[PDB]
Subunit: 226 residues, 6 copies
C-alpha cells in the first residue's frame, strides 16, 4: 500500500567480508515486502570502501577522487544484493533516480549505490525517498538506533526513541564529512529528511532481521518524523 526506500549500510552487508546468511535473509525479506509494497534499495560501502579510500590517501588523492573509489565499492556491494534478489531485482546497478523510477514501474526492485561525491549513500537514500515521494525511509546501520552520542564511544549515550528532523540535525548536521567518514546518517541526508519531512526509521542488524514487522511500526529503533 506504500512506497519504501531501504538504506542498507555496507558494513552491515559486508562486516569485513560478506555475511552470506544476512544477505540471503535480507534479500528474502525485501522480496516479501515488495509483494505488497513498492521497494527501492541503496547499499553502502563499509569496511572495504574505507580500505580502498585509505590506500588512495597514501597517494594523496583528492577527497573527490576518494569519493569516487568509495562509490565504485558501493556499486560492487549493490551487485551482491541484486544477486541475492534473483529475478525480483533490476539486473544492473541503478545510478540515477529516473532509472530507479523505471525499475519500480516494471515492478522490480531497483538497487543502487552511490551517485556523486560530497556525501554518503544515506544522502542517496534520502533523495531517492524524496524523488519517489516514498512513504517510509528505512536506514539499516550497525547500531540499534540514534543515540545522544556515539554508543561505541560514550557511556551515557541515550537511545532516543522518537524525534523531529530538526532534532536529528542537532545531533549531526554540523559534521564535516570526509571521504570514508561514517555516521548514523550523514549531515546531508539529515537535511534532506528534514527538508521534505521524510518518515525515517533507523535500526540495527538484529531488528533488520524482521523487516516486515519493522515497517509496521514494531521495532526497537529511532523514528525521525515531522
Amino acid at each position: 500500500a506504500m512506497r519504501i526506500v531501504f538504506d542498507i549500510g555496507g558494513s552491515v552487508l559486508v562486516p569485513e567480508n560478506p555475511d552470506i546468511d544476512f544477505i540471503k535473509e535480507i534479500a528474502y525479506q525485501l522480496t516479501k515486502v515488495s509483494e505488497d509494497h513498492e521497494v527501492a534499495v541503496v547499499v553502502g560501502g563499509g569496511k572495504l570502501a574505507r580500505k580502498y579510500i585509505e590506500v588512495a590517501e597514501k597517494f594523496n588523492s583528492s577527497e573527490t577522487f576518494k569519493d569516487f573509489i568509495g562509490i565504485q565499492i558501493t556499486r560492487a556491494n549493490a551487485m551482491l544484493l541484486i544477486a541475492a534478489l534473483r529475478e525480483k531485482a533490476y539486473p544492473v546497478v541503478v545510478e540515477d533516480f529516473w532509472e530507479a523510477w523505471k525499475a519500480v514501474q516494471l515492478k522490480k526492485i531497483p538497487v543502487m549505490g552511490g551517485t556523486h561525491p560530497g556525501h554518503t549513500t544515506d544522502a542517496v537514500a534520502a533523495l531517492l525517498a524524496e524523488f519517489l515521494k516514498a512513504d517510509l525511509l528505512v536506514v539499516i546501520t550497525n547500531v540499534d538506533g540514534v543515540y545522544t552520542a556515539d554508543p561505541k564511544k560514550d557511556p551515557t549515550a541515550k537511545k532516543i526513541k522518537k524525534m523531529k528532523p530538526e532534532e536529528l540535525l542537532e545531533i549531526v548536521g554540523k559534521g564535516i564529512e570526509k571521504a570514508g567518514s561514517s555516521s548514523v546518517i550523514d549531515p546531508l541526508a539529515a537535511k534532506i529528511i528534514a527538508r521534505s519531512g521524510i518518515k525515517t526509521i533507523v535500526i540495527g542488524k538484529e531488528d533488520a532481521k524482521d523487516l516486515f514487522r519493522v515497517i509496521k511500526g514494531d521495532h526497537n529503533g529511532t523514528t525521525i518524523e515531522p
Copy 2:
C-alpha cells in the same frame, strides 16, 4: 596556478541576462587564462527560482525542483560559453573529469549544476578539490562575507580573513532546499573545510579586475586554513 571561478547566477542573470557583466567577466576570464588554468561554474539566479516556484505550485518534490534548477544553470552556462568564444569548451561540462579534459586542451570548461541536494557553490568546491586548484574564487551579490546578512542587518561587519571553521559557523546549519540562497552553501562550506581550499569571496565590482583579485588585491573575504 589552477583557478576555479564560481559565478553566481544572480550576478550573471539578475532578471534578464546581464550582457555587460557577462561580457566584461568573459574578458577578465580570457585575460586570466592567458597565464593560468581556468575552470568555471555558473549558478541559476532569478530565472532558476522562477521555474522552481512554478514547479512548487504543482507539488513537485524538492528533488525534481533541484533538477529544474540544474537545467537553468546549464542554460546560463551556455551564455558564458558564448561570451568566451574560442577560449571555451564548446559544451556544458557535467562531469569533473570532462572539466579536466578541457583544461588539458587549454580550454575553459564552464559547468552548471550536477546533482540534487546542493547548489553550484558545492559543484565549484568539489571541482576545485578535484583539480587540486590553487584557488577558488566565488563571485556573488555581496562584496564579501559579513558577520551577518549585509543587506538586512545594520550591525553586519565584513570579515576580511577567516578559516573554514569560522565560515562554517556563519553557515553550515541551514538546510538547503531547492533554490535556497547563501553567501556560500553549507555543503560547499564543508568541502572547502575538509580540503582546506583557499577561497576568495568578492562582489561584482571586484570581478571587473580578476587579475588583481587573484593576487589578493580586493575588498572581499579570503578563507584559508
Copy 3:
C-alpha cells in the same frame, strides 16, 4: 483508441513568464485524454528562448550554438509540464524517439523538448508523430489557425479551415529558419507532415482549453490532411 502527439508552443505555455493556470489546465486535459488514448508531448521555447538566443548573438555565436541554447530552454519548459502532469508523466525530459516509445509502453506521458539544431520543436513533434505512427498531431500555437498570411501583420489574412500537406508547404516550406525564428509550423515540420501524410490540427490557446473536444474534430482551427 488512437495515438496522439501534441506540439505545444513555448510562448503559449510561457508568454513572458509561466501561465500557471493554462499549464495546470492543459496538464489536466492531457491527463484526461491519456485515459483513453496514447499521449506524447513536445514543448517549445518561446519568448525566453529568443532572449537567450539574442544574448548569444551579441557574442556572435554560430547559428548552431544558438540552436543548442534554444534546445536547453525547451527542455526547461518541458520540465514545467512534467511537473504539472504529476505521476502520469515520464519523470525526465525525453531526448530521443525510442525513449518516447518506452514511456508510452509504460503508459506514461513522455514530454520532450528539442533534439538537434537546424529546426524547431515542430519538426520534433512531426517526426515523433511519424515515429510512433500517431493518428493525430495537434499543434497548439499562439494563433487560432493557419492563415493566408501572418494574421498579426497582414489585414487580408484568410484563416484556411482545411488543406493538403502540399498546400501547407506552399504557405511555408521555402522559409530560411534561423535560430530563434518562429512560424505556425517550421518548413521541416511541413515537409515531414506532407512526407508521410500526418493528420494535423493547428489551434490557438482559446481552443486549446478544450483538447478533449478538439481531438474529436470540434474546434475552430486548421486541418492539414492528405
Copy 4:
C-alpha cells in the same frame, strides 16, 4: 583555414566500396590536413537506399528508414577512417562538439548521419556552421550545380558561381524523404544560406586534387553570399 568536406556515399560506395577513390581521397585529405584543419562527413549511397528499400517493404515509418540510413552512413564513415590511418579520429563522430575535440587534437573527425529528417549534406553544413569553418566542400556525382539535372535534361547548364538564394531556388522545395537524392538537400541549402557558408560543389575528378580545389581551381560550383 578550417575546412569541412561532405563526401557523397554514392561517390565513396557506388555499388561496393570504391577502394581506389577512398584511397585517393584519403591521401588528398591527409595532404590538406597538413596545413589546414579538416573535418569530414560521409553519406550512405547505394547501400543506404538498398537497406531502406527493404525496410519499406515492411511498411516502416520514414523516421525508422532514416535511422537505418544513418547506420549505413556510419559504416561508410569507418572505411574512410580506416583509409586515413593515424590522421583520423578512431571512431565515428556523432556530435558536433566531439568533432571539435578531434580538431583540437589535430585529428580528422569523420561523421556519418546524426538525426532523421535530412541527409548528411545538412550534417556537414551544420558542422561547418558550428566550427565556423572557412569553407564547405561538397563532393558528389555531378561536377557542379546545373540549371537542371545534368544527367537528365539536355539544356542543363553549369552554374559557375551563385548565391545561397539562387541555390535555394534550384532546391529547397523538395520534401526530403528517406534516401531521397539532391545535389544539395534543402535543409543543407537553408543552413548554408542562413550563415552564408562559402560552399564548393565538385565531382570525382576534381576531388583527385583537393589542394587546388580549396584555392578555387576547379570546374565545379562556388556558392557564397
Copy 5:
C-alpha cells in the same frame, strides 16, 4: 512457457542482398513463437560485413577496428529484422544485455547485433542466453547442422545429431578467429555453451522455415546439450 534466444546468421538473412521473403517469413514465425514464449534475437553480419572488413584490411586496419566495422554491419542487419517485426519488436537495436532484459519485460522482442571485438555474434547469443537464463539457444546458420568437418570442403563430413558441449569444443574451440572469420559456432560461443550448459540447436535455412516445430524438438539439426 520458456525463454528462447535466436542467433540468426547474417548470411542467412542477407545472402548477398536481403532475402525479403525469408525475413518476412522468419519475422512472422518469431512473432508467433513470442506469443507463448519470451523471445530475444541476435543477428549476424554475413557477406556484407566481410566486404567491409576486406576493405579495411586493404588499408591495414587492426583486427580490432575491423571487428568494430563488422559490428556496425550486424546492427544494420538487425534493423532489417526489427523492421520486419513491426510493433512486436523493441524499436532500437539493443547493445547490451541489461537492455535486452528490459525489452523482454515490456514483452517486446529485443533484436541485437554485435557487442565488443574479439568474437562473433554467436558469442553474443550464447552470453545473452546465459544472462537471461534462457531455456533454449537456437543457432540458425547456412548449413543444416554441425558436421564432423566443413560440409562444403570435406566429403566424409558426418552430420552429428546430438552431442555434449565438450564435444562441440573439440570440433571448434581451438580456432584462432580473425575479424571476418566464420564458423558454425565461434570458439568463444562454444565455451559459453559448455561453461553453463546451454541447450543449443543448430539448423539451416530450410529447417529455419518452421521455427515453431523446431523449438518443439522436431528438426533435422544438431542438439548440443549437457
Copy 6:
C-alpha cells in the same frame, strides 16, 4: 614505442591492496611514460573471486558473475590511477578509443574490464592490437610461462621464447568461466596469435625495473611470431 601493460589483480591486490607494489609499479610506469606511450589494464585478483563466490551461492549466471568481476577490476584500476597521480587519465577507461584519447593527451589510461566472457588479459591484448602497440607486457604471479604449472608440477620448465602457436597449445582449450585463472587467458592468447603481438610475461621481481624489461632484459617469457 607504444607499450601496453597488463597488471594482474592478484599482483596488485594479493589479499588487501599491495601498497608498496602499487607504489613501486607506479614509479616504473611513470619512468617509462617519459620516453614511451603507456596504456594500462588491471585485473580483479583475490577480491574479484571473493565477490564472485558470493554471487555463486545465489545461483547467479556466469554472465552476471563476470559483470561483478568487471566492477572489482575497475576499483583496482582506480588505486593505480591514484598512484600515478598527475600522469594518469583521471577516470577508469572503458572503451579503446578513450584509451587512444588519453594517449593523445600524453596521459596514461588505466582500464579495468570491458565485457563478459573473458578476462582483463584479453582486454589488454585487444587494446594492444587496437593501438598497434609495439609491445604487450603481462605482469603476473609467476615469473614466466612454463611447460606446466610452476606452482604445482615439479617438472614444469620455463620457456624463454616461443611463438603464439606454442603459447596456444599450453592454453586455448580451457573454457574460461567467471574468475578462472590462467597465465594468459585463451581468448587473449588467440588475439596475440591473430595479430602477432610481441608479448612479454614476467613476475613481480622483474616488474621492479620495467625500463630493463622493455629492452628484453628480464627472466620472463617472450612471445612473438
